[PDB]
Design a protein around this ligand. Structure first.
Ligand SMILES: Cc1nn(-c2cccc(CNC(=O)Nc3ccccc3)c2)c(O)c1-c1cc2cnccc2[nH]1
Ligand SMILES: [Ca+2]
Ligand SMILES: [Cl-]
Ligand SMILES: [Cl-]
Lengths: 57, 247
């Protein structure tokens, strides 16, 4: 459930009918096969700091 | 910002500077290539709406380093429920006349889903507030972009520790050491979660800054997500100023 631990989702989270849960990702991101994680699909995704991201790359 | 530090260049890439006739007006937050979120109060006194400039990739106001990007403000959208010279519903959506170009120094902050913002982000204690505002109460403003880590208070706890509505929240310190301040308004209250940053708040206003026995006041952005999203999907209308219904 989405209310707890964010449903395990890295980003966005939707409850469904049953013991069902769906994680989602912001535009400029994609959901990984783990069904929780989000990875950038673009050069400059929102809420990321390039010089710091690069500093760790 | 009072009691903060300099935001290292490019580490606050979503931060916007608003100008009127070349003069510092307010702060803002980039959420998309053409959209900036600010504070409604910033516009209460605007005479010639056509002289509004938004600057991205800004840092040190004393110099031009080439990372700066200026755009005209094509639209200022304010909630119908906002009353000038007040605090409630202190939010504004700005449409840029032309998109900014995303770079290392110009990046938008994620506008979150409401639910996520409410159930998760709202419980992250500490968040970052920034601007080129007053360094001191009754002081000069900053030449360099400043940033400040501030904790968020539950509204109950705010009142105990002290007109706070459901459209606001409290963040900061009451010891008078640390606050956001005049010139900072419209700036971001930015919240980290799992390696990404989100727009949770807007620097509103109040009495003073760094006023002992008081907490900083911020517009609760979660209350506005749907309103913002709808607007962003809508076609521009002639005339700069637009009052849009809320909810
Ligand atoms: C004071 C003040 N003035 N402005 C300001 C900045 C830009 C345009 C306008 C014009 N709007 C107007 O005059 N409305 C109005 C309407 C009717 C009556 C009085 C005022 C004002 C501020 O942002 C603050 C401010 C104080 C403060 C304290 N702590 C954190 C942040 C803070 N911000
Ligand atoms: Ca500069
Ligand atoms: Cl429309
Ligand atoms: Cl006009």
């Amino acid at each position: 459930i989405c209310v707890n631990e964010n449903g395990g989702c890295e980003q966005y989270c939707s409850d469904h009918t049953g013991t069902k849960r769906s994680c989602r990702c912001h535009e400029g991101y994609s959901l990984l096969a783990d069904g929780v994680s989000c990875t950038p699909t673009v050069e400059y995704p929102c809420g990321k700091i390039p010089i710091l991201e690069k500093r760790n790359a | 910002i009072v009691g903060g530090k300099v935001c290292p260049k490019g580490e606050c890439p979503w931060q916007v500077l608003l100008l009127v006739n070349g003069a510092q007006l307010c702060g803002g937050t980039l959420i998309n290539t053409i959209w900036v979120v600010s504070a409604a109060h910033c516009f209460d006194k605007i005479k010639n709406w056509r002289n509004l400039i938004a600057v991205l990739g800004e840092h040190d106001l004393s110099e031009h380093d080439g990372d700066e990007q200026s755009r005209r403000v094509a639209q200022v959208i304010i909630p119908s429920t906002y009353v000038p010279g007040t605090t409630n519903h202190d939010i504004a959506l700005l449409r840029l006349h032309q998109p900014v170009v995303l770079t290392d120094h110009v990046v938008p902050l994620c506008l979150p889903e409401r639910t996520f913002s409410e159930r998760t982000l709202a419980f992250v204690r500490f968040s970052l507030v920034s601007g080129w505002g007053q360094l001191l109460d009754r002081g000069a403003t900053a030449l360099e972009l400043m940033v400040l880590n501030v904790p968020r208070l539950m509204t109950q706890d705010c009142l105990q520790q002290s007109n706070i509505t459901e459209y606001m929240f409290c963040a900061g310190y009451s010891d008078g050491s640390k606050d956001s301040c005049k010139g900072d308004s419209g700036g971001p209250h930015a919240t980290h979660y799992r390696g990404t940053w989100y727009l949770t708040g807007i620097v509103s206003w109040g009495q003073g800054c760094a006023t002992v026995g008081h907490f900083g006041v911020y517009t609760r952005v979660s209350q506005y997500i749907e309103w913002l999203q709808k607007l962003m999907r809508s076609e521009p209308r002639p005339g700069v100023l637009l009052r849009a219904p809320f909810p």
